Amino acid sequence: DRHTVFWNSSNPKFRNEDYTIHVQLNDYVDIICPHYEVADAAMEQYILYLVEHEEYQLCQPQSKDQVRWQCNRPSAKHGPEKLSEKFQRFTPFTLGKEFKEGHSYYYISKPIHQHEDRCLRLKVTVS
Amino acid sequence: DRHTVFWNSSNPKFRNEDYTIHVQLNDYVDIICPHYEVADAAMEQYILYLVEHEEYQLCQPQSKDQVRWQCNRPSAKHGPEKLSEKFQRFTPFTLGKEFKEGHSYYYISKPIHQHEDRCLRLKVTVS
Amino acid sequence: QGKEVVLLDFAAAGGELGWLTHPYGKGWDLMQNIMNDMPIYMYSVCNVMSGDQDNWLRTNWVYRGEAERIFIELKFTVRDCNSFPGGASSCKETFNLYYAESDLDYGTNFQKRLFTKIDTIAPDEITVSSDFEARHVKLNVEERSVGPLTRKGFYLAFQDIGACVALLSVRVYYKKCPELLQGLAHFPETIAGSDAPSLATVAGTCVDHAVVPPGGEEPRMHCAVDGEWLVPIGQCLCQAGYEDACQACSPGFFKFEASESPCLECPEHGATSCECERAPQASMPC
Amino acid sequence: QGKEVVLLDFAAAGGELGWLTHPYGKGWDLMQNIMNDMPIYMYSVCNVMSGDQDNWLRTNWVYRGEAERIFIELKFTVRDCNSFPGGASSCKETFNLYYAESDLDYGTNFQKRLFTKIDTIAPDEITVSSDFEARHVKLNVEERSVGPLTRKGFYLAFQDIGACVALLSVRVYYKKCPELLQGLAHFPETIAGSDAPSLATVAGTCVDHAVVPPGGEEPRMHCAVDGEWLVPIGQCLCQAGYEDACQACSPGFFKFEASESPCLECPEHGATSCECERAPQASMPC
Numbered sequence: 001d002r003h004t005v006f007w008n009s010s011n012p013k014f015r016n017e018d019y020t021i022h023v024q025l026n027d028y029v030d031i032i033c034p035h036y037e038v039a040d041a042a043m044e045q046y047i048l049y050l051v052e053h054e055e056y057q058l059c060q061p062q063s064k065d066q067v068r069w070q071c072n073r074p075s076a077k078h079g080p081e082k083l084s085e086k087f088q089r090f091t092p093f094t095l096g097k098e099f100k101e102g103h104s105y106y107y108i109s110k111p112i113h114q115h116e117d118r119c120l121r122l123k124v125t126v127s
Numbered sequence: 128d129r130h131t132v133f134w135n136s137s138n139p140k141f142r143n144e145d146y147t148i149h150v151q152l153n154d155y156v157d158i159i160c161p162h163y164e165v166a167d168a169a170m171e172q173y174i175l176y177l178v179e180h181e182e183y184q185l186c187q188p189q190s191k192d193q194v195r196w197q198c199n200r201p202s203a204k205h206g207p208e209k210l211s212e213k214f215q216r217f218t219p220f221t222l223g224k225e226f227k228e229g230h231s232y233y234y235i236s237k238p239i240h241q242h243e244d245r246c247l248r249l250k251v252t253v254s
Numbered sequence: 255q256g257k258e259v260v261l262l263d264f265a266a267a268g269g270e271l272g273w274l275t276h277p278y279g280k281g282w283d284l285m286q287n288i289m290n291d292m293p294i295y296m297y298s299v300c301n302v303m304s305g306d307q308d309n310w311l312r313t314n315w316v317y318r319g320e321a322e323r324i325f326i327e328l329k330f331t332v333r334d335c336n337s338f339p340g341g342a343s344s345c346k347e348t349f350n351l352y353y354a355e356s357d358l359d360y361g362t363n364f365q366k367r368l369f370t371k372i373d374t375i376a377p378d379e380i381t382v383s384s385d386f387e388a389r390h391v392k393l394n395v396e397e398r399s400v401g402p403l404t405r406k407g408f409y410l411a412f413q414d415i416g417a418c419v420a421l422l423s424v425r426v427y428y429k430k431c432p433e434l435l436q437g438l439a440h441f442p443e444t445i446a447g448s449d450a451p452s453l454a455t456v457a458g459t460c461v462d463h464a465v466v467p468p469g470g471e472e473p474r475m476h477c478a479v480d481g482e483w484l485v486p487i488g489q490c491l492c493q494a495g496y497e498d499a500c501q502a503c504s505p506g507f508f509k510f511e512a513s514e515s516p517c518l519e520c521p522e523h524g525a526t527s528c529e530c531e532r533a534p535q536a537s538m539p540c
Numbered sequence: 541q542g543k544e545v546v547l548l549d550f551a552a553a554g555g556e557l558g559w560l561t562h563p564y565g566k567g568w569d570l571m572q573n574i575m576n577d578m579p580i581y582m583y584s585v586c587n588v589m590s591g592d593q594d595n596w597l598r599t600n601w602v603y604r605g606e607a608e609r610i611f612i613e614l615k616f617t618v619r620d621c622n623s624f625p626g627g628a629s630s631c632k633e634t635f636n637l638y639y640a641e642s643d644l645d646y647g648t649n650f651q652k653r654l655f656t657k658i659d660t661i662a663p664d665e666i667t668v669s670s671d672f673e674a675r676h677v678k679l680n681v682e683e684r685s686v687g688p689l690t691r692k693g694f695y696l697a698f699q700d701i702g703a704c705v706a707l708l709s710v711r712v713y714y715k716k717c718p719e720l721l722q723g724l725a726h727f728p729e730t731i732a733g734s735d736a737p738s739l740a741t742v743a744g745t746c747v748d749h750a751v752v753p754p755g756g757e758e759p760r761m762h763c764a765v766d767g768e769w770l771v772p773i774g775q776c777l778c779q780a781g782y783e784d785a786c787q788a789c790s791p792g793f794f795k796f797e798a799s800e801s802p803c804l805e806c807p808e809h810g811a812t813s814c815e816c817e818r819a820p821q822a823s824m825p826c
Contacts, residue, residue: 217333
């Protein structure tokens with residue numbers, strides 16, 4: 001099954017800086033980028049990073065080798081740009097990540113053109 | 128979910144003349160016609176009839192208005208010819224059938240070109 | 255009408271044609287009944303008592319080709335919400351017809367946001383409860399049309415909002431004015447336009463051994479949205495020595511100028527005229 | 541090589557292209573990683589410890605067009621069965637490449653029985669356990685080819701039998717010999733054949749103001765399976781009075797006959813020759 005996550009400042013789940021989702025193996029996490037149809041400058045755009053607890057706590061990435069997906073298409077014709085992460089135990093692709101049972105994984109944001117008012121982050125925990 | 132039924136004399140489930148399948152609402156019954164890739168005359172072909180208990184017991188149909196599907200393509204390129212009956216409570220099509228809960232429905236055969244050695248029939252019961 | 259060029263025909267596919275359903279599995283389903291002793295298939299949906307229904311049936315990607323205006327012929331049946339003796343609250347008696355243009359086939363990647371509403375299709379004959387036992391098929395016919403089409407191809411979609419529908423036919427076609435031979439002139443096959451009043455002026459080319467007389471109007475035809483050739487202007491006539499085609503005059507017969515008239519006999523002495531090898535002024539009795 | 545005409549390109553579709561999976565949902569899955577600071581998509585399957593695996597990934601219907609021999613370029617990664625520290629009994633390190641021809645798109649109606657096995661694709665570089673932490677991508681390249689194709693179109697299919705595969709690219713293309721200008725002759729774009737030794741003899745048409753000399757071989761080219769133009773035979777030369785194109789001689793210069801030679805000056809009195817308005821035998825000093 002799948003867990004929908006609308007990654008935007010207007011989501012109240014991000015306001016306490018402790019947004020946490022609980023998943024089971026072989027499940028998908030659908031991170032929905034901001035989407036519009038509004039001022040072209042006011043359109044939120046983020047860089048999603050799959051990181052470690054240190055990068056999560058400090059809300060700052062250590063390297064570009066952590067960049068997961070780009071929310072660079074806010075007024076996309078087709079629909080909202082998404083990042084669909086299968087929480088699979090095994091991957092045939094090395095640059096991708098394997099999700100072990102009983103572990104926590106962290107996602108962090110960085111505004112592409114806007115100012116960082118608050119820290120946008122999510123914690124995914126495998127049951 | 129779906130229940131596979133290979134309608135052919137070689138199926139031992141038909142040999143006691145009491146082949147019975149038990150279904151639940153909104154489920155499919157997949158009646159798989161005989162299929163080959165053998166002598167063109169020896170290829171079994173049947174007329175499937177959705178009938179009443181009287182036609183079932185006597186193993187003889189009362190009218191053409193009971194003919195369900197034809198197993199007239201035994202050496203079909205694509206694969207075996209099938210008849211997929213959804214055991215749905217409601218139909219938007221009048222010539223089709225509605226399947227009520229706690230009822231029994233009966234299917235009977237007639238060889239297209241071959242001789243009727245035994246009676247080929249199936250009873251479908253809704254739980 | 256003129257010539258129809260069929261781009262999609264569901265009832266001709268013999269069940270072999272599979273259309274995507276969204277959400278996957280749920281919603282519309284392929285059925286196999288017998289009608290007029292013929293095997294038939296159909297797409298059905300009847301989630302009348304569930305609620306929050308948004309069931310999409312999307313045809314496969316259709317290559318537009320040269321088509322400017324497509325015609326969509328739907329044959330379906332719709333059941334009345336009072337035909338359910340149980341009572342259906344979230345019940346509807348309509349479905350919405352959508353279309354989408356694309357230069358690429360997205361296959362399984364279906365996005366509703368890309369589909370434009372053609373119309374709200376309603377039955378002209380609604381299936382009442384007494385119809386099932388009566389074995390009466392109330393088969394509704396609805397023709398819709400979209401134009402102008404421009405991208406490499408399109409999809410047609412049938413979105414259901416909680417009704418009891420059975421779709422027996424979907425036939426998409428465009429019209430063309432056929433290759434014509436008229437007034438001893440050839441007019442090529444012309445794609446009918448998209449705009450209802452529009453008439454494309456098609457120039458003619460004279461048949462073998464025919465000419466457009468001096469002063470005379472050049473052969474022209476007008477191609478209509480339905481594929482009809484309308485309002486003939488001008489024509490071609492058989493050239494000097496010729497008389498539906500232009501063939502030379504039989505010996506002892508002649509034709510001086512290009513005209514409707516046939517080849518006249520030769521009194522008293524091919525052909526454009528008859529030699530005397532006297533007359534001062536070559537079609538007169540020399 | 542010559543010119544390639546691309547019929548399918550998965551990595552160019554930007555994730556927008558959706559391929560059917562059978563059984564529905566289960567099996568292959570679309571992934572979204574980042575490679576060389578670029579967003580990329582891929583089809584993955586890794587049901588190494590389940591068993592009785594028969595997971596089909598079928599591309600969309602591809603219009604063959606004029607293509608006789610298609611070329612299939614696959615870029616994939618495959619993980620070793622000993623890379624699983626748990627131990628996978630039903631594990632495989634291969635997948636089978638299939639194809640099927642049809643004149644109709646069946647959409648969702650996928651039937652394995654209609655697919656012909658092209659090959660058993662094996663990795664040249666197998667993903668070992670140490671590769672993940674090393675962030676080393678072992679990207680395997682396998683080119684296969686099918687010919688002659690005849691129906692309106694085809695599908696490509698990737699059937700998995702219980703392996704750990706990640707398919708990053710699928711690029712189908714056919715070759716053509718390009719529109720050529722050679723030896724003052726025009727040779728049209730020609731579809732490359734299907735059979736490996738085969739060479740289609742293509743006749744040339746002389747360029748503007750060029751002629752094939754009497755006795756001289758008529759311009760001809762041979763089109764190869766890779767799209768190469770091989771073995772030139774004959775040529776065209778600039779006609780009398782002309783000298784990469786054929787242009788008339790500058791005044792006071794002439795050219796008597798069609799030849800490789802350019803236009804020579806005019807001693808001592810267009811152009812094919814220079815008038816004296818004496819000489820007995822029109823290119824000699826008159």
